[PDB]
Design a protein around this nucleic acid. Structure first.
Length: 175
RNA sequence: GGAUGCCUCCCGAGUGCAUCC
């Protein structure tokens, strides 16, 4: 994995995420509002995309130039409530079914990493979903790759974490 | 003649599908 695997490829890295748009009027509109703004703000919004019906909106800046001017002209705001400007992403966890991952179904409503990592081994990302606040009885895990995923998967596929031989399917694809 | 269910964990998530009554 020299250097890296997946990376960004656009006009310029200068990016920025917009959170807290307030899903009241209409996200689509909220994102646009910020758009038209970037247009009448004397510049050319490099990137402009949305994320999940009501998650957030991403955007790229022409460069320190257009970026500087923007920051200087706070204003922005969807309509009334302010928003958050920052780009912590750097990757993609959604719309990627966790490429090279493995989800575990059927839980004991009291499992953790002990029994989890216990059944698995090549699991780089161990996470369980089931703890009060509306139980679920389902755990999720990620693998450094599909190779180890399929192997371990089909392997532990038949275990016994809750007297029901916990479930474990694959999730993702490749890229 | 009728209609809906689902994709968990996880900051870009929507070229999204199936069957039943």
């Amino acid at each position: 994995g020299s250097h890296m695997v997946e990376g960004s490829e656009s006009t310029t890295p200068f990016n920025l995420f917009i959170g807290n748009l307030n899903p009241n009027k209409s996200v689509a509109e909220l994102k646009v509002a910020i758009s038209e703004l970037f247009a009448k703000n004397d510049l050319a919004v490099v990137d402009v995309r949305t994320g999940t019906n009501r998650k957030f909106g991403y955007v790229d800046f022409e460069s320190a130039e257009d970026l500087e001017k923007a920051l200087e002209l706070t204003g922005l705001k969807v309509f009334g409530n302010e928003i958050k400007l920052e780009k912590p992403k750097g990757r993609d966890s959604k719309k990627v079914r966790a490429a090279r991952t493995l989800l575990a179904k059927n839980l004991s409503f009291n499992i953790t990493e002990d029994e989890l990592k216990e059944v698995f081994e090549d699991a780089l990302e161990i996470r369980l979903v089931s703890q009060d606040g509306k139980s679920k009885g389902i755990a999720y895990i990620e693998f450094k790759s599909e190779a180890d995923a399929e192997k371990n998967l089909e392997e532990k596929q038949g275990a016994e974490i809750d007297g029901r031989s916990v479930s474990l399917y694959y999730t993702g694809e490749k890229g």
